[PDB]
Amino acid sequence: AMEANIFCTFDHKLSIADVGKLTKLVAAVVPIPQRLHLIKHYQLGLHQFVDHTRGYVRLRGLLRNMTLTLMRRVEGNQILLHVPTHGLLYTVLNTGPVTWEKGDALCVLPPLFHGPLARENLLTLGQWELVLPWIVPMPLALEINQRLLIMGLFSLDRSYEEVKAAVQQLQTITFRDATFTIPDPVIDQHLLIDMKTACLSMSMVANLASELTMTYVRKLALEDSSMLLVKCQELLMRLDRVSPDDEIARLSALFVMLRQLDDLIREQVVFTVCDVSPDNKSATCIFKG
Amino acid sequence: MAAMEANIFCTFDHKLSIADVGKLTKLVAAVVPIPQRLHLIKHYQLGLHQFVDHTRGYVRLRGLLRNMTLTLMRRVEGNQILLHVPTHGLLYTVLNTGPVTWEKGDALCVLPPLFHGPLARENLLTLGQWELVLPWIVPMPLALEINQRLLIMGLFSLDRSYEEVKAAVQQLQTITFRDATFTIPDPVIDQHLLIDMKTACLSMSMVANLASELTMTYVRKLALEDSSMLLVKCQELLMRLPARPQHVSPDDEIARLSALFVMLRQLDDLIREQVVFTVCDVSPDNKSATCIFKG
Amino acid sequence: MDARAVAKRPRDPADEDNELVTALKAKREVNTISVRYLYHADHQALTARFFVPEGLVEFEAQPGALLIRMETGCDSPRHLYISLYLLGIRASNVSASTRCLLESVYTASAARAALQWLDLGPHLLHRRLETLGCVKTVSLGITSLLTCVMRGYLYNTLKTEVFALMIPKDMYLTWEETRGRLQYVYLIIVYDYDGPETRPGIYVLTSSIAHWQTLVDVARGKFARERCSFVNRRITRPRQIPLCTGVIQKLGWCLADDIHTSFLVHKELKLSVVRLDNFSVELGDFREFV
Amino acid sequence: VVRCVRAQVDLGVEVRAARCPRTGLWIVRDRRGRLRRWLSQPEVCVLYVTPDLDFYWVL
């Protein structure tokens, strides 16, 4: 009567105290890059995806196409992992730094903390370090995405002081008994390529919308059939106060910048809480994939 | 009400020749659409030949295909097709039908076929003024482009000459996705493409109004000191024509970016219709793939 | 590993005994607890348990009703579980007669506090409402205990009674005269961005349409006036950021034949409702559109 | 209600009226709710008085 379980081993000589460190992480969701059956421990967590060169939201895009197992049982020489299926309930540990409550829509985010921190004593080897994805509720995830994206938008004008105080304002967030702070996406007054592609795509779709749409709705008024369409170009006239293959190229690049933004503008709720354990360390959630 | 039968038997009234039963045995564990959801359906309702019209409106076919219930073929025998409408979440194998190579980790969407007709010479169960029509299981970026080019061919064809239209269909019918060339059968402007154009243009007008004082000048400030092939390739599709930000008010920028995300999603869902299968592992000859998200 | 292991027949749960029976039977003891039939083993519906103050559990002694947790900017009572009927004093869709009926049953302390908390923030409703699903039992204390149903059918213990989802008549809305074999249910919040009020209209739609684009293309065709109101308040009042004219989440699905009109009586207040007898809850996120 | 296509003047007329919520103007109907339809007729003119003695003269 065994369940479908993916077995993961370890190649290093894991000591007894390190297993005892590992045994606390029972209901901790760990991603998997590829649904194998027996997998090495180098592909268990985000430390196969750690890149000092690349940014943060590239990891958010690469977390979408993972497989998010749960540590079913920890013992000697192999670790059990449980692939969840849609509809059955599972316990999840609060590996994220945010408190949870009954019925919150949970979403999975790459951890905004890494390396040296007073609570980042994690499962570590000589070169391997286990890092866990964050599990935060839905509106906090939306707000964090907006904060990091706006802080990426201020990457060029950082020399002024109003922008610096704005970065100090956006970098922190108050939540339910949370004085949480995020890291800044810029380091050493130059921006990483992930955030640069994100803000470039957003600025491009905003600029192309500000360029094409007046001409298109002005062309649409000849074949106008709804009063919703004539009044929308009126506000374009209010706000404002070529080769055809290039026009096709402009529309195509607009849709390319639209396609390169779905990793930011939406996210799927993964868990929702049925019950939270007392002291908020764990909770019981149904799956929703 | 009686429950929806997970075991759907399709029957046959034509005299099946032996090659027809042979070609019907090829299509085990494939996708077929059915709108009826009874237990003992006939063969006329099975497939997509009930909706193929003389219009050949491919956008109309995409509009109707989203409402059809997708099932899986199982246990083909004499005059019996046991179909299984799959419950959401579990996994079972599907099989490709078109020449579309797949990957692992991507997603799959349902689609009416491309260059559909006697060009590839499909003898897929032809009997008595009826053909078995198969929806394509296509991956994610192909399903993105196959509606992006649809909407662009809709939007361009307003207020312009017909020779521009005939020069624009041939620039936007080929798709060179993943070592293969596909052609779309007759992209024709209809009322459905019109209402899709109306939704698209309203959303992009509202997001043009919704743009803040900084996000429209980000590339304008960036392109003075930056040099990259990405920035150069995106700059030339714009017109030609230190400084200070006007007023930083991030309390307003959160609301602007939130409603801008809503407008971007409202533009986005015109080409991102439905994820219907997430492929996990393929066969090496790519004839099939075990996948999840069935239903 | 051999031929008989794969050739073994599949396992049925009711044939084999429970865990506790074969645990006690080995060491040869018998206790006063009867363990030969263990309840709630064959219960596919995923459920939970939530507390609620007494001020909200009017129109709730009947089993089967929607339950949406609402947000609250405080710290201690910061989450509160309100029924759909108590949200009826906020919908502009509700007529005056039904509103004056159902506001005359929530004349307690905490009901008006949730009424004020809905109309005190800067945000909309669907940025403060989170659906939990449907109840199936009460407990009726001074702090009543509810059992909500998260995913699956609604039934009693021992499955002897199928509870039914109740929705009031004003929020009900169909867009077809011929219902299919199935029709899903959706929860529709559509905002009226008119001058003095942004008070939305709450609707529960029972449609046979499944694919989401093929739902929103008729959602625009049924709520066009509110779209014009949204763009009108956008063009009229700049330096304001309106968003999400209509928000739709999938509530669940039904059988499209057991849907009939009924009523609930409580404190001799007859309220005409729509009764969905075999409803299976399948919650979804508040998907937003324009 | 006065009217100059026929030089016909109508004296004792009752009108139910309220605001159009989509805008800020007035909507004038009958007690049955006819949505009183002389305002589109180009020849008539009406005088409106309210119970708080507010005055209106509508071309």
Side-chain angles (χ1 to χ4, degrees), chain B residues 193-257:
Chain B
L193 195 47
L194 280 155
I195 197 177
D196 219 29
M197 279 184 264
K198 287 147 55 181
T199 45
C201 71
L202 179 138
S203 44
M204 62 200 296
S205 88
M206 213 85 57
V207 78
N209 184 31
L210 216 52
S212 56
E213 65 175 33
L214 54 93
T215 178
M216 274 182 302
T217 179
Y218 171 66
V219 62
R220 297 302 186 89
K221 294 177 301 176
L222 182 61
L224 271 295
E225 74 278 5
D226 188 292
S227 300
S228 89
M229 180 52 81
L230 168 66
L231 197 52
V232 165
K233 198 68 182 297
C234 73
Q235 195 176 355
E236 321 307 332
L237 55 97
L238 301 182
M239 74 215 65
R240 188 58 159 174
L241 269 297
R244 197 95 156 92
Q246 285 283 302
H247 48 83
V248 278
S249 157
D251 52 329
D252 184 282
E253 301 329 286
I254 300 147
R256 282 242 185 185
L257 263 296

Coordinates of all heavy atoms in Angstrom, one line a residue, chain B residues 193-257:
Chain B
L193 N -13.3 37.9 -34.7 CA -12.1 38.6 -34.8 C -12.3 40.1 -34.6 O -11.4 40.8 -34.0 CB -11.4 38.3 -36.1 CG -9.9 38.7 -36.2 CD1 -9.1 38.2 -34.9 CD2 -9.3 38.2 -37.4
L194 N -13.4 40.7 -35.0 CA -13.8 42.1 -34.7 C -13.9 42.3 -33.3 O -13.4 43.3 -32.8 CB -15.0 42.5 -35.5 CG -14.9 42.8 -37.0 CD1 -16.2 42.6 -37.7 CD2 -14.3 44.2 -37.2
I195 N -14.7 41.5 -32.5 CA -14.9 41.8 -31.1 C -13.6 41.5 -30.3 O -13.3 42.2 -29.3 CB -16.1 41.0 -30.6 CG1 -16.6 41.5 -29.2 CG2 -15.8 39.5 -30.4 CD1 -17.8 40.9 -28.7
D196 N -12.7 40.6 -30.8 CA -11.4 40.4 -30.2 C -10.5 41.7 -30.4 O -9.8 42.1 -29.5 CB -10.8 39.2 -30.8 CG -10.0 38.4 -29.7 OD1 -10.4 38.5 -28.5 OD2 -9.0 37.7 -30.0
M197 N -10.6 42.3 -31.6 CA -9.9 43.5 -31.9 C -10.4 44.6 -31.0 O -9.6 45.5 -30.6 CB -10.1 43.9 -33.4 CG -9.2 43.1 -34.3 SD -9.4 43.8 -36.0 CE -10.6 42.6 -36.7
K198 N -11.7 44.7 -30.8 CA -12.3 45.7 -30.0 C -11.8 45.6 -28.5 O -11.4 46.6 -27.9 CB -13.8 45.7 -30.0 CG -14.4 46.2 -31.3 CD -15.6 45.4 -31.7 CE -16.7 45.5 -30.6 NZ -17.9 44.7 -31.0
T199 N -11.7 44.4 -28.0 CA -11.2 44.2 -26.6 C -9.7 44.6 -26.6 O -9.3 45.2 -25.6 CB -11.4 42.8 -26.2 OG1 -11.1 41.9 -27.3 CG2 -12.9 42.5 -25.9
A200 N -9.0 44.2 -27.6 CA -7.5 44.4 -27.6 C -7.2 45.9 -27.6 O -6.4 46.4 -26.9 CB -6.9 43.7 -28.8
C201 N -7.9 46.6 -28.5 CA -7.6 48.1 -28.7 C -8.1 48.9 -27.5 O -7.4 49.8 -27.1 CB -8.3 48.6 -30.0 SG -10.0 48.7 -29.9
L202 N -9.2 48.5 -26.9 CA -9.7 49.2 -25.7 C -8.7 49.0 -24.6 O -8.3 49.9 -23.8 CB -11.1 48.7 -25.3 CG -11.6 49.4 -24.0 CD1 -13.1 49.7 -24.3 CD2 -11.6 48.5 -22.8
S203 N -8.2 47.7 -24.4 CA -7.2 47.5 -23.3 C -5.9 48.2 -23.5 O -5.4 48.8 -22.6 CB -7.0 46.0 -23.2 OG -6.8 45.4 -24.5
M204 N -5.4 48.3 -24.8 CA -4.2 49.0 -25.0 C -4.3 50.5 -24.9 O -3.4 51.2 -24.5 CB -3.5 48.5 -26.2 CG -4.2 48.8 -27.5 SD -3.7 47.7 -28.9 CE -2.0 48.3 -29.1
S205 N -5.5 51.0 -25.3 CA -5.8 52.4 -25.1 C -5.8 52.8 -23.6 O -5.2 53.8 -23.2 CB -7.1 52.8 -25.7 OG -8.2 52.6 -24.8
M206 N -6.4 51.9 -22.8 CA -6.5 52.2 -21.4 C -5.1 52.1 -20.7 O -4.8 52.8 -19.8 CB -7.5 51.3 -20.7 CG -8.2 51.9 -19.6 SD -9.6 52.8 -20.1 CE -10.6 51.5 -21.0
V207 N -4.3 51.2 -21.2 CA -3.0 51.1 -20.6 C -2.1 52.2 -21.1 O -1.1 52.6 -20.5 CB -2.3 49.7 -20.8 CG1 -1.7 49.5 -22.2 CG2 -1.3 49.4 -19.7
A208 N -2.3 52.7 -22.3 CA -1.6 53.9 -22.8 C -2.0 55.1 -21.9 O -1.1 56.0 -21.6 CB -1.9 54.2 -24.2
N209 N -3.3 55.2 -21.5 CA -3.7 56.3 -20.6 C -3.1 56.0 -19.2 O -2.8 56.9 -18.5 CB -5.2 56.3 -20.5 CG -5.7 57.4 -19.6 OD1 -5.0 58.5 -19.5 ND2 -6.8 57.3 -19.0
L210 N -2.9 54.7 -18.9 CA -2.5 54.3 -17.5 C -1.0 54.5 -17.3 O -0.6 54.3 -16.2 CB -2.9 52.9 -17.3 CG -3.4 52.6 -15.9 CD1 -4.5 53.5 -15.5 CD2 -4.0 51.2 -16.0
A211 N -0.3 54.8 -18.3 CA 1.2 54.9 -18.2 C 1.6 56.1 -17.3 O 1.1 57.2 -17.5 CB 1.9 54.9 -19.5
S212 N 2.5 55.9 -16.4 CA 2.9 56.9 -15.5 C 3.9 57.8 -16.2 O 4.3 57.7 -17.4 CB 3.5 56.3 -14.2 OG 4.5 55.4 -14.5
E213 N 4.5 58.8 -15.4 CA 5.4 59.8 -16.0 C 6.8 59.2 -16.2 O 7.6 59.8 -16.8 CB 5.5 61.0 -15.0 CG 6.1 60.6 -13.7 CD 6.2 61.9 -12.8 OE1 5.4 62.8 -13.0 OE2 7.2 61.9 -12.0
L214 N 7.1 58.0 -15.6 CA 8.4 57.4 -15.6 C 8.6 56.2 -16.5 O 9.6 56.0 -17.1 CB 8.9 57.1 -14.2 CG 8.0 56.2 -13.3 CD1 8.3 54.7 -13.4 CD2 8.0 56.6 -11.9
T215 N 7.5 55.4 -16.6 CA 7.6 54.2 -17.4 C 7.6 54.4 -18.9 O 8.0 53.5 -19.6 CB 6.5 53.2 -17.0 OG1 6.7 52.0 -17.8 CG2 5.2 53.8 -17.3
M216 N 7.2 55.5 -19.3 CA 7.2 55.8 -20.8 C 8.6 56.5 -21.2 O 8.9 56.5 -22.4 CB 6.1 56.7 -21.2 CG 4.8 56.0 -21.5 SD 3.5 57.1 -22.0 CE 3.4 58.2 -20.6
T217 N 9.3 57.0 -20.2 CA 10.6 57.6 -20.5 C 11.7 56.8 -20.0 O 12.9 57.3 -19.9 CB 10.7 59.0 -19.9 OG1 11.9 59.6 -20.2 CG2 10.5 59.0 -18.4
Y218 N 11.5 55.5 -19.6 CA 12.6 54.7 -19.1 C 13.5 54.3 -20.2 O 14.8 54.4 -20.0 CB 12.0 53.4 -18.5 CG 13.1 52.4 -18.2 CD1 14.1 52.8 -17.2 CD2 13.3 51.2 -18.8 CE1 15.1 51.9 -16.9 CE2 14.3 50.4 -18.6 CZ 15.2 50.7 -17.6 OH 16.3 49.9 -17.3
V219 N 13.0 53.9 -21.4 CA 13.9 53.6 -22.5 C 14.5 54.9 -23.0 O 15.6 54.9 -23.5 CB 13.1 52.8 -23.6 CG1 12.0 53.5 -24.1 CG2 14.1 52.3 -24.7
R220 N 13.7 56.0 -22.9 CA 14.2 57.3 -23.4 C 15.4 57.8 -22.6 O 16.3 58.5 -23.1 CB 13.1 58.3 -23.4 CG 11.9 58.0 -24.3 CD 12.4 57.8 -25.7 NE 11.3 57.6 -26.7 CZ 10.7 58.5 -27.3 NH1 11.0 59.8 -27.1 NH2 9.7 58.2 -28.1
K221 N 15.4 57.5 -21.3 CA 16.6 57.9 -20.5 C 17.6 56.8 -20.6 O 18.8 57.1 -20.4 CB 16.2 58.1 -19.0 CG 15.3 59.3 -18.8 CD 14.8 59.4 -17.4 CE 14.1 58.1 -16.9 NZ 13.8 58.1 -15.5
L222 N 17.3 55.5 -20.8 CA 18.2 54.4 -20.8 C 19.1 54.5 -22.1 O 20.3 54.2 -22.0 CB 17.5 53.1 -20.8 CG 18.3 51.9 -20.7 CD1 19.2 51.9 -19.5 CD2 17.5 50.6 -20.7
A223 N 18.5 54.9 -23.2 CA 19.2 54.7 -24.5 C 20.3 55.8 -24.8 O 20.8 55.8 -25.9 CB 18.2 54.7 -25.7
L224 N 20.7 56.6 -23.8 CA 21.7 57.6 -23.9 C 23.1 57.0 -23.6 O 24.1 57.4 -24.1 CB 21.4 58.8 -23.1 CG 20.6 60.0 -23.7 CD1 21.4 60.6 -24.9 CD2 19.2 59.6 -24.1
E225 N 23.1 56.1 -22.6 CA 24.3 55.6 -22.0 C 24.5 54.1 -22.2 O 25.6 53.6 -22.0 CB 24.4 55.9 -20.5 CG 23.4 55.1 -19.7 CD 22.0 55.6 -19.7 OE1 21.7 56.5 -20.5 OE2 21.1 54.9 -19.1
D226 N 23.4 53.4 -22.5 CA 23.5 51.9 -22.6 C 23.7 51.6 -24.1 O 23.3 52.3 -25.0 CB 22.1 51.3 -22.1 CG 22.1 49.8 -22.1 OD1 22.2 49.1 -23.1 OD2 22.1 49.3 -20.9
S227 N 24.3 50.4 -24.3 CA 24.6 49.9 -25.6 C 24.4 48.4 -25.6 O 25.2 47.7 -24.9 CB 25.9 50.3 -26.1 OG 26.1 51.7 -26.2
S228 N 23.4 47.9 -26.2 CA 23.1 46.4 -26.3 C 22.3 46.1 -27.5 O 21.5 47.0 -28.0 CB 22.3 46.0 -25.0 OG 20.9 46.1 -25.3
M229 N 22.5 44.9 -28.0 CA 21.7 44.5 -29.2 C 20.3 44.4 -29.0 O 19.5 44.7 -29.9 CB 22.3 43.1 -29.7 CG 21.6 42.6 -30.9 SD 21.6 43.7 -32.3 CE 23.2 43.5 -33.0
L230 N 19.8 44.1 -27.7 CA 18.4 44.1 -27.4 C 17.9 45.5 -27.4 O 16.8 45.8 -28.0 CB 18.3 43.5 -26.0 CG 16.9 43.7 -25.3 CD1 15.8 43.0 -26.1 CD2 17.0 43.2 -23.9
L231 N 18.6 46.5 -26.8 CA 18.1 47.9 -26.8 C 18.1 48.5 -28.2 O 17.2 49.3 -28.6 CB 18.9 48.7 -25.8 CG 18.3 50.0 -25.4 CD1 16.9 49.8 -24.9 CD2 19.1 50.7 -24.3
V232 N 19.1 48.2 -29.0 CA 19.2 48.7 -30.4 C 18.1 48.1 -31.2 O 17.4 48.8 -32.0 CB 20.6 48.4 -31.0 CG1 20.6 48.5 -32.5 CG2 21.6 49.3 -30.4
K233 N 17.8 46.8 -31.1 CA 16.8 46.1 -31.9 C 15.4 46.6 -31.5 O 14.5 46.6 -32.3 CB 16.9 44.6 -31.7 CG 16.1 43.8 -32.8 CD 16.8 44.0 -34.2 CE 16.0 43.2 -35.3 NZ 16.0 41.8 -35.1
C234 N 15.2 47.0 -30.2 CA 13.9 47.5 -29.8 C 13.8 49.0 -30.1 O 12.7 49.5 -30.0 CB 13.6 47.2 -28.4 SG 14.5 48.2 -27.2
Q235 N 14.9 49.7 -30.3 CA 14.8 51.2 -30.4 C 14.3 51.6 -31.8 O 13.6 52.6 -31.9 CB 16.1 51.8 -30.1 CG 16.1 53.3 -29.9 CD 17.4 53.9 -29.6 OE1 18.4 53.2 -29.4 NE2 17.4 55.2 -29.4
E236 N 14.7 50.8 -32.9 CA 14.4 51.3 -34.2 C 12.9 51.2 -34.6 O 12.5 51.7 -35.6 CB 15.2 50.4 -35.2 CG 16.6 50.1 -34.8 CD 17.5 51.3 -34.4 OE1 17.3 52.4 -34.8 OE2 18.4 51.0 -33.6
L237 N 12.1 50.5 -33.8 CA 10.7 50.5 -34.1 C 10.0 51.6 -33.4 O 8.7 51.6 -33.3 CB 10.1 49.1 -33.6 CG 10.4 48.7 -32.2 CD1 9.3 49.0 -31.2 CD2 10.8 47.2 -32.2
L238 N 10.7 52.6 -32.9 CA 10.2 53.8 -32.3 C 10.6 55.0 -33.1 O 11.5 54.9 -34.0 CB 10.7 54.0 -30.8 CG 10.3 52.8 -29.9 CD1 10.8 53.1 -28.5 CD2 8.8 52.6 -30.0
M239 N 10.0 56.1 -32.8 CA 10.3 57.4 -33.5 C 11.6 57.9 -32.9 O 12.2 57.4 -32.0 CB 9.2 58.4 -33.4 CG 9.1 59.0 -32.0 SD 7.4 59.3 -31.5 CE 6.7 57.7 -31.5
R240 N 12.1 59.0 -33.6 CA 13.4 59.6 -33.1 C 13.1 60.5 -31.8 O 13.6 60.2 -30.8 CB 14.0 60.5 -34.2 CG 15.4 61.0 -33.9 CD 16.3 59.9 -33.5 NE 17.7 60.3 -33.7 CZ 18.8 59.6 -33.3 NH1 18.6 58.4 -32.8 NH2 20.0 60.1 -33.5
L241 N 12.3 61.5 -32.0 CA 11.9 62.4 -30.9 C 10.3 62.3 -30.7 O 9.8 62.2 -29.6 CB 12.4 63.8 -31.1 CG 13.7 64.2 -30.5 CD1 13.7 64.1 -29.0 CD2 14.9 63.4 -31.1
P242 N 22.4 66.0 -17.0 CA 21.3 65.1 -16.7 C 19.9 65.8 -16.5 O 19.9 67.0 -16.5 CB 21.8 64.4 -15.5 CG 23.2 64.4 -15.5 CD 23.5 65.8 -16.2
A243 N 18.9 65.0 -16.3 CA 17.6 65.4 -16.1 C 17.1 65.0 -14.7 O 17.8 64.3 -14.0 CB 16.6 65.0 -17.2
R244 N 15.9 65.4 -14.4 CA 15.2 65.1 -13.1 C 14.0 64.4 -13.3 O 13.2 64.6 -14.3 CB 14.9 66.5 -12.4 CG 14.7 66.4 -10.9 CD 15.9 66.6 -10.1 NE 15.7 67.1 -8.7 CZ 15.6 66.3 -7.7 NH1 15.7 65.0 -7.9 NH2 15.3 66.7 -6.5
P245 N 13.6 63.4 -12.4 CA 12.3 62.9 -12.3 C 11.3 64.0 -11.9 O 11.7 64.9 -11.1 CB 12.4 61.8 -11.3 CG 13.6 62.1 -10.5 CD 14.5 62.7 -11.4
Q246 N 10.1 64.0 -12.4 CA 9.2 65.0 -12.1 C 8.7 65.0 -10.7 O 9.0 65.9 -9.9 CB 8.0 64.9 -13.1 CG 8.3 65.4 -14.5 CD 8.3 66.9 -14.7 OE1 7.3 67.6 -14.3 NE2 9.4 67.4 -15.1
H247 N 8.0 63.9 -10.3 CA 7.6 63.8 -8.9 C 7.5 62.3 -8.6 O 6.7 61.6 -9.2 CB 6.3 64.5 -8.6 CG 5.2 64.2 -9.6 ND1 4.4 63.1 -9.5 CD2 4.7 64.9 -10.7 CE1 3.5 63.1 -10.5 NE2 3.7 64.2 -11.2
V248 N 8.4 61.9 -7.7 CA 8.3 60.5 -7.2 C 7.2 60.4 -6.2 O 7.3 61.0 -5.2 CB 9.7 60.0 -6.7 CG1 10.6 59.6 -7.8 CG2 10.4 61.2 -5.9
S249 N 6.2 59.6 -6.6 CA 5.1 59.3 -5.6 C 4.8 57.9 -5.7 O 3.9 57.4 -6.5 CB 3.9 60.2 -6.0 OG 2.7 59.6 -5.5
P250 N 5.5 57.0 -5.0 CA 5.4 55.6 -5.1 C 4.0 55.0 -4.6 O 3.6 54.0 -5.1 CB 6.5 55.0 -4.3 CG 6.8 56.1 -3.3 CD 6.6 57.4 -4.0
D251 N 3.4 55.8 -3.8 CA 2.0 55.5 -3.3 C 1.0 55.5 -4.5 O 0.1 54.7 -4.5 CB 1.6 56.4 -2.3 CG 1.7 57.9 -2.7 OD1 2.7 58.1 -3.5 OD2 0.9 58.7 -2.3
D252 N 1.3 56.3 -5.5 CA 0.5 56.3 -6.7 C 1.0 55.3 -7.7 O 0.3 54.7 -8.5 CB 0.5 57.7 -7.3 CG -0.3 57.8 -8.6 OD1 0.2 57.4 -9.7 OD2 -1.4 58.5 -8.5
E253 N 2.3 55.0 -7.6 CA 3.0 54.1 -8.6 C 2.5 52.6 -8.3 O 2.5 51.8 -9.3 CB 4.5 54.2 -8.5 CG 5.0 55.6 -8.9 CD 4.1 56.3 -9.8 OE1 4.1 56.0 -11.0 OE2 3.4 57.3 -9.4
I254 N 2.3 52.3 -7.0 CA 1.7 50.9 -6.7 C 0.4 50.7 -7.4 O 0.2 49.7 -8.0 CB 1.7 50.7 -5.2 CG1 3.0 50.9 -4.6 CG2 1.1 49.4 -4.9 CD1 3.0 51.4 -3.2
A255 N -0.5 51.7 -7.3 CA -1.8 51.6 -7.9 C -1.7 51.6 -9.4 O -2.4 50.8 -10.1 CB -2.7 52.8 -7.4
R256 N -0.9 52.5 -10.0 CA -0.7 52.5 -11.4 C -0.1 51.2 -12.0 O -0.6 50.7 -13.0 CB 0.3 53.6 -11.8 CG -0.3 55.0 -11.8 CD -0.3 55.6 -13.2 NE -0.8 57.0 -13.2 CZ -1.0 57.7 -14.3 NH1 -0.7 57.2 -15.5 NH2 -1.5 59.0 -14.2
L257 N 0.9 50.6 -11.3 CA 1.4 49.3 -11.7 C 0.5 48.2 -11.5 O 0.5 47.2 -12.3 CB 2.7 49.1 -11.0 CG 4.0 49.4 -11.7 CD1 4.1 48.6 -12.9 CD2 4.1 50.9 -12.1

